[PDB]
Design a protein around this ligand. Structure first.
Ligand SMILES: NCCCNCCCCCC(O)(O)C(F)(F)F
Ligand SMILES: [Br-]
Ligand SMILES: [Br-]
Ligand SMILES: [Br-]
Ligand SMILES: [K+]
Ligand SMILES: [K+]
Ligand SMILES: [Zn+2]
Length: 356
């Protein structure tokens, strides 16, 4: 069976100055609603949300960071505004901390359900997102790094060296996730992201292909950066075919986490890409051949309400065992994307024998 967690309480996090800010509360209600419409919801086993504990947060975050974000809970508006503006792209309301605890806790429960064999796989319709969050700071709509925390939680209830793969197909680089695991050979981080030579958020050259990890983590950080063109299904299918999947098989994860942002989607106001729902279905389907089907799909970004609802529903459909929808005829990829994939191929060929 396929697990699903959703809690409307996570809608409580909101922007009291700009109510039309793209990271909307209804991002999660709309995705959930689409699951009802497509009658996918009843096919799933509902997994309860819970609060992450401060101890669980400490798995990836410093006492300082946890403490300050926690304090925002009892802050007055003007102090909330001040505190948020101290970060890169953050808004805060009195409910933000709790919502971020719920987001992470929901994912812990889902990973637990997967690892105990209660479900085979699962989707987590959560917010605020997580993958920009660093050990010591909030960033890009994220407070705590949900997927990173779920990885450590997973290892904490199995064995410390449980091989976790994190595929991050949110259109932005997960800077927080890369950094948290940069010296780690037990968590393989693979991100596809619009890069534009560092001009695309989060504007750091950390996201380039030559950042392959440090220390015993060398080779266990894979950045696939897109430059120039409007990337869509063919570019992503080719990157999975040439890079993501063979690296994944060689790594042989025991658990796959998808930092599944849907802002690379056709229609997204931010991403500028054109991955279709069918595309996301095929990416999901391929990831399902890993870790004996143990896949947790975690909502990150994505800001066209219609696009993210259709896209994530299609993923859940794949996790339920539906056959992949047919892709549009795959155009020869944009020459820029070929150059990107070759750069990664050359950068990780020394660490992965499947790449040569
Ligand atoms: N003029 C400044 C534009 C800054 N734009 C911020 C984009 C944030 C993206 C967040 C995300 O989609 O990566 C997450 F997954 F975290 F939600
Ligand atoms: Br923005
Ligand atoms: Br239903
Ligand atoms: Br952006
Ligand atoms: K990404
Ligand atoms: K790593
Ligand atoms: Zn994003």
């Amino acid at each position: 069976i396929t697990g699903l967690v959703y809690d409307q309480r996570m809608m409580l996090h909101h922007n009291m100055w700009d109510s039309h800010h793209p990271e909307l509360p209804q991002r999660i209600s709309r995705i959930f609603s689409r699951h009802e419409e497509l009658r996918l919801l009843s096919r799933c086993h509902r997994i309860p949300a819970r609060l992450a504990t401060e101890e669980e947060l400490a798995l990836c975050h410093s006492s300082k960071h946890i403490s300050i974000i926690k304090s925002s809970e009892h802050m007055k508006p003007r102090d909330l505004n001040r505190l948020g503006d101290e970060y890169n792209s953050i808004f805060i309301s009195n409910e933000s901390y709790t919502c971020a605890l719920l987001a992470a806790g929901s994912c812990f429960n889902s990973a637990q359900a997967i690892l105990t064999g209660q479900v085979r796989n699962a989707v987590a319709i959560v917010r605020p997102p997580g993958h920009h969050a660093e050990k010591d700071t909030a960033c890009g709509f994220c407070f705590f790094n949900t997927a990173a925390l779920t990885a450590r939680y997973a290892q904490s209830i199995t064995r410390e060296s449980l091989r976790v793969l994190i595929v991050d197909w949110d259109v932005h680089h997960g800077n927080g996730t890369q950094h948290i695991f940069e010296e780690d050979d037990s968590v393989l981080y693979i991100s596809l992201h619009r890069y534009e030579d560092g001009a695309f958020f989060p504007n750091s050259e950390d996201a380039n292909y030559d950042k392959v990890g440090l220390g015993k983590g060398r080779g266990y950080n894979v950045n696939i950066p897109w430059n120039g063109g409007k990337m869509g299904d063919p570019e992503y299918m080719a990157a999975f075919h040439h890079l993501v999947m063979p690296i994944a098989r060689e790594f042989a994860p025991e658990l796959v986490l998808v930092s599944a942002g849907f802002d690379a989607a056709r229609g997204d106001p931010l991403g500028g890409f054109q991955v279709t729902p069918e595309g996301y279905a095929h990416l999901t389907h391929q990831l399902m051949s890993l870790a004996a089907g143990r896949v947790l799909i975690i909502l990150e970004g994505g800001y066209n309400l219609t696009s993210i609802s259709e896209s994530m529903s299609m993923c859940t459909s794949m996790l339920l065992g539906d056959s992949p929808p047919s892709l549009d005829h795959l155009t020869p990829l944009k020459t820029s994307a070929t150059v990107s994939i070759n750069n990664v191929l050359r950068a990780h060929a020394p660490f992965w024998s499947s790449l040569r």
